[PDB]
Amino acid sequence: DVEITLV
Amino acid sequence: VSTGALRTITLSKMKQSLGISISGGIESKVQPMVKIEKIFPGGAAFLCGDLQAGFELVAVDGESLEQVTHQRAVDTIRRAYRNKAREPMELVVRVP
Ligand SMILES: [Zn+2]
Ligand SMILES: [Zn+2]
């Protein structure tokens, strides 16, 4: 359940 | 350095891209904490020799990222990096 987003 | 030591790192907002991916957030059972997932070429963070993937984000420009959702973390860092008047950006982190 780990979210990863390019900031 | 001890595990999880606190470190304050400054980062210029001059580059248009921060150039980092972040991971985690309080909804996550596996990674409750926000960490830098990857540092990308071209961005501001690739140029800071004290920033590494795997660091835990604690605060940005005085705004706590402790126990925040992934969405709030993304929003908070974006707003800080786009606030060019406040230079440089201040990131409080916990090293592995
Ligand atoms: Zn959710
Ligand atoms: Zn944290």
Residue numbers in the entry:
A (entry chain D): 734 to 740
B (entry chain A): 851 to 946
Task: Give the text the authors published on this PDB structure.
In cochlea, deafness-related protein PDZD7 is an indispensable component of the ankle link complex, which is critical for the maturation of inner-ear hair cell for sound perception. FCHSD2 is expressed in hair cell and localizes along the stereocilia in a punctuate pattern, where it co-operates with CDC42 and N-WASP in regulating apical cell protrusion formation. At the extreme C-terminus of FCHSD2, there is a type I PDZ-binding motif (PBM, a.a. sequence Ile–Thr–Leu–Val) for associating with PDZ-containing protein. In this study, we uncover the interaction between FCHSD2 and PDZD7 through yeast two-hybrid screening and further verify the interaction using Coimmunoprecipitation (Co-IP) assays.
We proceed to solve the complex crystal structure of FCHSD2 tail/PDZD7 PDZ3 by the molecular replacement method at the resolution of 2.0 Å. Consistent with our biochemical characterization, the FCHSD2 tail/PDZD7 PDZ3 complex shows a 1 : 1 stoichiometry in the crystal structure. Five antiparallel β strands (βA–βE) form an open β-barrel, which is packed with two α-helices (αA and αB). FCHSD2 tail forms the complex with PDZD7 PDZ3 that buries a total interface area of 526.6 Å2. Val740 from FCHSD2 tail inserts into the hydrophobic pocket of PDZD7 PDZ3 to form hydrophobic interactions with Leu868, Ile870, Ile872, and Val924 of PDZD7. The main chain atoms of Ile870, Ile872, and Gly874 from the βB form hydrogen bonds with Val740, Thr738, and Glu736 from FCHSD2, and stabilize the interaction. Intriguingly, in the FCHSD2/PDZD7 structure, Gly869 and Ile870 at the carboxylate-binding loop provide amide nitrogens to interact with the carbonyl oxygens of Val740 via a highly ordered water molecule. Arg928 also participates in interactions with the carboxylate to further stabilize the terminal carboxylate group.
